[PDB]
């Protein structure tokens, strides 16, 4: 069950990169948006998930906040099982 | 080989519209996107607008009025644009480029000039 | 939406001469600046992409330099071929824009 919840892994990645090509699909079109380019897309996705959010970038539009939103939580479960399973292990 | 293949021209009467198309060979990928760039003779280059094949959604430059609609064909790999009700201020060339998702223009079509006139 | 302006509209440079295109951002963009080369009758062709980086197939002689809103193009002696229209282009936010171009001229 330990390296069994490590499937939050496999989630958080998936989001990632959906919430990356989904925020570039939501963002493009809404004029002065900066998440539209893929590659930073995927860092603005880590940077969101992690709940670092720097600032350097974020959405501008509705869809682009929802994706933002389920990033974040996707992130929080995730990081929420991993850190679960590190102090269970040990 | 030919990444982007665009017919050399078009005659248009004033008033009436035309289908331009760029089949596109290549890799192609999920985050592809197909821009239309509009060039007057002696003038500068003018973003039209943009499509995402994989999806199919299309976004428009605002500060222009709008003549353009964009649709994309994945199974023949080809992108359209319909330019409709046109004048002689339409009358350009109209090239198609490809973009990786990542900001700028890999490749570009020939161009297709468009001539509006009776 | 960002506003590129490329001034001078035209550059004449002597044969062998190093050359400097100007692009100036109305706000800063990093460095989300492309550049691209049309000859006369010719598609435009890119030359520089993310303002320095190469492209594979174009001569060592173009590099490109800047960020936040002012950029450069150069290119190190000058040769009959570099006689083209040099536009910028802009990714940094929606929706892409293009300069209005500097065209090279050379003094034989």
């Known amino acids: 069950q330990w390296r069994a919840a490590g499937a939050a892994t496999v989630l958080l990645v998936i989001v990632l990169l959906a919430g990356s090509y989904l925020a570039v699909l939501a963002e493009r079109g809404a004029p002065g948006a900066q998440l539209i380019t893929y590659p930073r897309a995927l860092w603005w996705s880590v940077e969101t998930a992690t709940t670092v959010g720097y600032g350097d970038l974020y959405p501008v539009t509705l869809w682009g906040r929802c994706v933002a939103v389920v990033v974040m939580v996707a992130g929080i479960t995730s990081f929420g099982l991993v850190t679960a399973a590190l102090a269970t292990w040990f | 080989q030919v990444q982007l293949q665009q017919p050399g021209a078009e005659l248009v009467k004033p008033g009436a519209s035309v289908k331009l198309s760029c089949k596109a060979s290549?890799?192609?990928?999920?985050?592809?996107?197909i821009h239309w760039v509009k060039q007057r003779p002696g003038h500068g280059l003018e973003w039209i607008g943009e499509?995402?094949?994989?999806?199919?959604?299309?976004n428009y430059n605002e500060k222009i009025q709008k003549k353009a609609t964009l649709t994309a064909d994945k199974s023949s790999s080809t992108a359209f644009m319909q330019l409709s009700s046109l004048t002689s201020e339409d009358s350009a060339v109209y090239y198609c480029?490809?973009?990786?998702?990542?900001?700028?223009?890999?490749?570009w079509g020939a161009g297709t000039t468009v001539t509006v006139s009776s | 939406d960002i506003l590129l302006t490329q001034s001078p509209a035209i550059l004449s440079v002597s044969p062998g001469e190093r050359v400097s295109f100007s692009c100036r951002a109305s706000?800063?963009?990093?460095?989300?600046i492309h550049w691209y080369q049309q000859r006369t009758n010719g598609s435009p062709r890119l030359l520089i992409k993310?303002?320095?980086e190469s492209i594979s197939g174009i001569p060592s002689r173009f590099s490109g330099s800047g960020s936040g809103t002012d950029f450069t193009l150069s290119i190190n002696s000058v040769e009959s071929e570099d006689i083209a229209n040099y536009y910028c282009?802009?990714?940094?936010?929606?929706?892409?824009?293009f300069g209005s171009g500097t065209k090279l001229e050379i003094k034989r």
């Open positions: 290549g890799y192609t990928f999920t985050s592809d996107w």
């Open positions: 282009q802009q990714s940094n936010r929606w929706p892409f824009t």
């Open positions: 480029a490809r973009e990786r998702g990542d900001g700028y223009f890999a490749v």
């Open positions: 993310y303002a320095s």
């Open positions: 706000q800063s963009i990093g460095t989300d």
């Open positions: 499509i995402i094949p994989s999806y199919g959604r299309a």
